[PDB]
């Protein structure tokens, strides 16, 4: 509230939201276990990727990291399904590279805000299919 | 086969198994998209964890990393369920810290070998519940 | 003015405001002396803090740094007093961690904008009392 | 479009605009050649600058980098000329350091958005004359 | 006492003196809050200083750091006032650079030993006026 | 002259030639402004280049940097035009990669020696067209 | 022998085997000369390789380094010839990438154990022909 | 040819000579395989050398690296044999350390220029015998 | 037990064995005190060793570290005495360097497993006499 | 003696005292063996310590390192026993944290001066019991 | 002699010339003592220089280092005197900055080649007077 | 004088003594020239020293640096001669290593305090002869 910028308190509430999921010691320990497992798995996955896939990851980092540096998801009842379909529709109409990269950043931010890991990775899996249309694949292979 | 150590060819076949999942350019690009999203999400998650949870992650790293440095999952029809229940049974009988840490490393390795992300993170989620019994939580809070 | 974003010139005026305080060579040298003294004192203070206090500082850095990276004070007649009391009132009503961390960042920014060192550190001293209610202390000890 | 923030797609379109200039392999190679030449020239130029000029560059970095971290050009028919004259007019009226530094950052951003190198460096050359009035030179020599 | 060097126990008592100020959890948290605020403010201040002031800070570091590497303040009732006046008197008689730099180091050490932040920064503010006589300013501008 | 190697004095005269362009404080400040702008623009350009173009830049660095480590332009009336045409003629006769890379290094050195930025970047622009014949593009795409 | 693991003494005997080749001061100096020459040559070779070849080297490092981290040659009368032919036969039957990478690691280990440099590099030369069948080349170009 | 320094085009032709050996994809892959093997072998060799041999390598680096920083081999029909014998003759007459170190650098450069690995390492092997006369061994043991 | 590799649980039990020695807070603090003292003493010891001894330590590191990277002690009633005598007997028969280095690594591992510091350093002291026979000393001085 | 500060020669005699223990090559080699073993054991011990014990070690480092940076043992017949008992007596009377930390630093320095490893670690073991009274444990758990 | 570049053997003879001054162990030890003393003195001198002098040193480094990277003294009877006077004469006629910087590099190289330390530093002392004419001082203060 | 430690003002006077030698701009520039020359010469000298001499320098650093970290010369009429002879006399009586190392540190400190470079290096030259008696050479060769 006021003297404080209202946008500011909301941002801080949002940044401390994980704490509502860490109510007991058991919750903390389970989070630690899952993080260890997930982080080891991701580090290992990258270690098995050949340079073709690594260069595609580099391209995504180049554009998504640039924009991000230059400039309902934490709910219990979260509808990735309609967001997916809305995305699919935007992609059939707009054939630019930009909107595809924008979708990647948008979904990534929903993933940051989502406190359910199974839901998060289902979202990533579905939306990566939707984002990788023939148009996106053609851009990525062209500029790599 | 022979002059080569048979264990060696099997290890190399295993390490190149992801390539059977990367058959088309689209498969490569989707993998790149999912990796970007997953890695951003994990980096962001850690950034929101308070020092209590970070110290619990440190403990797991200390023991699991030590052992790992000192010393059916890639299939289509993978049964985490029975592995879980076998683990649950070992934990009711053996109350040592070691077997709990061993389970973490074991499941982490199954996660490395699993080429299906939704299945992998369901496994982590279920098994982290099973591993974090009152006994494990008590150890972790005691030594942190 | 215009072709330039008006927000931009104001931001640049604000960032060069210290220069009005550095009018003579003597002003520059006194600033250098005070900075040396203050910076040595702060480095020394941290060096005498035990790990309990350091972990509490880490928690503040984790959340305040996250928000800050994700997203009248320079006047002669500055009223910390009413700002304090407004803060105190917000804290009696809102018991969230977020608003407490938001207050820390807000007051820190007023401190950045304040060109009077005695006034600045009186502000910090008063407001740190106000921010550290039983609610904030309970959060910080809980998650550390 | 919508579920996506409209500002976001526009930002991503803007960040991928160079790709319209890299349509053929020849375009990529020529860009690589020009970048090598330009970057070698700039590195070499700095290497021949004495400490007086380097300290003036440091001052610009200190204030422009601070603001930038705290917070029609890509067209074919780009009018630096009127922008220059508008700037010249603002500088005759406003004698603050801030507006001069703001002009530097503003023109630098137009340079980032400009996909024509000859036009870009003509812009820099003209506008550096306009920005470096006696007022700006006096500030810069005073605080260096 | 004895087998131990008496100077040694006194030095260790002195180095652990902050702990008498950190008696409760609230005291620890308030210290953490004030340190965060003060350290952010000081880092920000330096970031707004032009190269002239930075070179003056460098000079102080060069001589005070050299001597320090080559080789009543923590009380409740601390008299900066008489120390100031004693300093002022030494400076009217001794016109050397050395005694001015010695005063800086001396007052800095009193600041280290002072467990009251408002008193500390009042001391720095007053004594920086006293140390920066025309003689000191002349030395500093001459050798910079 | 003599006891000194004549080549040596000439090299030192050449390395200090920028100083004739930095006669006034205004000249120093304008140079600082232009350098800031040019360097920001170049850093930004690289940040928007995809991995295809970056690998082409790497190839140029690999060969031009190797040779350079293993082993009239500063005038007012400089004729890039005839140098261009001489280059064009050498390239129609000699189809080797080496002579193309040699041209890049040669023109880069003329750029180093040129104290006029508009002339320099016109030179780079023209000569990059001339160097990037079908032969050069074919080499670069082949070995990348 | 026993209390010691027999595998351990054998491993240590193997690791100190070079010392039988360094019997005189002359042997040490000749080894130093040959190492300098060989290491300079290899560093220089890499420096002349374009990014295409470097990415192929990266692929080999990615898979061979992964397996190696996860998990008769020192004789006078060493038969690379039959080992080659055995390898050739395994490759005609097994078309997997894994067995090709396994051969690389296997031959590399024979090279480590071989104390004759001319024999070692003849082995590498022959076996690199044998390993690089159309199948291996197709894998490597596909995933790069 | 001319406007270009003739020495320069020749140097660039020389630096790109490996490309004539990398005509097919198979040639690139075989080069990558051989480089991996050779580089692993050399890294492993150094790892088994005791400090005596390492200090002898350091001596060669100290003098050969100093000179190199201060300041027919790529043919099909290359005669190391006569070069060896010419070297042997120079060493019988000149007993200085310098000429021995000069031979090392000279042969190392022939090795850089030689595009045949078996021939290169035969050269190194033969010439290291020739260079390591009693005179060279005496120097190296004396100054180590 | 089973689904888990039995070797794995045993390894994890072994790696967490210190925790049985850290049952109370006092045990933790005493361990911290002893570690500080022991680590300071060892760092200080190395700092007083001349380059002769440091090169001998380097030799041990070179061979023991190589093997270790390439590839009853925690009991209350531990018999170093018989292990010593068994070692002494192996050394009278086997005059190789390898078995001496193997003994060093073997005893070092017993030291890692031993949770009694006085017993551990008695072991090291005795066994270092036994390992350093005239044969070992001759090897070490020869190759240093 | 004189022109030299007598304290200085004594300090240098003290710093070279280990050399009287390194009279033969065998003595050097045994020292190298014992250092390797002791240092490996200590590095390994730390690697098995959980974060609780590590934070207690951090506290000791924070205060003992601060004082040490701010500001009969090498004999054959050394009496730790009476020093222990003197310490025990000081601790029963003085309940400050400082004197406990002073004892740690004092005993650590005796350990530095002691050239007998078995005696040194017996000293550490005994004195760590004596220093870790209920008072010290209470301080350390309170501030961690 | 020939197959070897004659310039090369001469360069290597020159680079190993110090060895004629290190004929005995005593010569080596005295060199080590003098180097320690000289290097400590020079490091200490720089540590007492204020930023004015440091910026003048930076200017010399900028130009002398640039030229050196871009591109009778070791005798017993060395005449600095005539070289000085020749330099003095060149400076009265040539008023450019370049020739002054060239003299610095020239004399520095004579210093490198001079194996007598007293003679070397007399040379530096005399020639620094000669080089620092009013013309050089004016350049250096102007561009700093 | 008093409130200030008298030792402190004297230390600061001593640390700023060079400034009396830097009275004019010419003095600053000459100092910069001499420092550049001396520092280049010393860096170059070390680069030509073989590992034997470097290990002797390491030994001096090990002991002199240890003591220095653990714990009339600036006059116009300075008598190195009598100090030398006093040293010579102490060395004939005291045959310890310590007193020789103490002399090195003592003379090094006189060198730090001496503001005349020719006198300083004459001192180093003379005293290095005096310190390097047969006794010192024997120690240094023994422990290297």
From Swiss-Prot, chains A, B, C, D, E, F, G, H, I, J, K, L:
Changing residue 99 to L: No effect on the binding to host BCL2L11. Changing residue 102 to F: Increased binding to host BCL2L11. Induction: Expressed in the early phase of the viral replicative cycle. It is found in: Host mitochondrion outer membrane; Host cytoplasm. Belongs to the orthopoxvirus OPG045 family. Homodimer. Interacts with host pro-apoptotic protein BCL2L11 (via BH3 domain). Interacts with host NLRP1. Interacts with host BAK. It comes from Vaccinia virus (strain Ankara). Its main location: host cell. Changing residue 67 to F: No effect on the binding to host BCL2L11. GO terms for biological process: regulation of apoptotic process; symbiont-mediated suppression of host apoptosis. It comes from the Viruses. The chain holds residues 34 to 186 of 222 of the full protein. This is Apoptosis regulator OPG045. Keywords: Host cytoplasm, Host membrane, Host mitochondrion, Host mitochondrion outer membrane, Host-virus interaction, Inhibition of host apoptosis by viral BCL2-like protein, Membrane, Modulation of host cell apoptosis by virus. Plays a role in evading host innate immune response by inhibiting host inflammasome activation. Interacts with and inhibits NLR-mediated interleukin-1 beta/IL1B production in infected cells. At the host mitochondria outer membrane, interacts with the BH3 domain of host BAK and prevents BAK from binding active BAX. In turn, host apoptosis is inhibited. Changing residue 99 to F: Increased binding to host BCL2L11. One of its GO terms (cellular component) is membrane.
